[PDB]
Amino acid sequence: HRKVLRDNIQGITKPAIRRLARRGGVKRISGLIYEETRGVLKVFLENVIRDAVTYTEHAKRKTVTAMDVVYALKRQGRTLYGFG
């Protein structure tokens, strides 16, 4: 069950970025939007995941629940409704 991962930021694809953009009301999307949006997503996930990891490592636990992700998003001021 040991494994290392790499290059998973290409897994969030460009016609899957275009749908997140066209939900927000965007009518035209340039070509260089994608890597910048992937980096924005990367730093946001890095902040919230580091917060969740510190939350779960304080509890002497080994898995990541959804409640800790909710607390991590609460600490950034983006509260999530729907998980407890």
């Binding site: 939900r23 983006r78 999530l80 409704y81």
Partner: protein, 106 residues
């Protein structure tokens, strides 16, 4: 014969549970007896305001169930509930459908 504290105020939310959560939430050492009655009152009124607009949205959509798309619609369409829940996002809620007028053709 004795009657419950939730219906002593004529409400639905349990006064005892909010009293217990105010105690064990570690907000003060003591808590007044009017505090849970007030808090349950404002809570019940608040969820009444949510569910009434949600039912009107779902009946406006010719549906019979409250899915969270209706909750997101009822919250984002309001003015003074949008200020209460402006930062909060809603799971599986979607957005309020509105398109900028300059994007639309003439």
């Amino acid at each position: 014969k004795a009657k419950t504290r939730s219906s002593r105020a004529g409400l639905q939310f349990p006064v005892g549970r909010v009293h217990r959560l105010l105690r064990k939430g570690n907000y003060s050492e003591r808590v007044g007896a009017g505090a849970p009655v007030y808090l349950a009152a404002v809570l019940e009124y608040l969820t009444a305001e949510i569910l009434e607009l949600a039912g009107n949205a779902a009946r406006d959509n010719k549906k019979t169930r409250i899915i969270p798309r209706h909750l997101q619609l009822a919250i984002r369409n309001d003015e003074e509930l949008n200020k209460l829940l402006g930062r909060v996002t809603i799971a599986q809620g979607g957005v309020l459908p509105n398109i900028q007028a300059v994007l639309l053709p003439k």
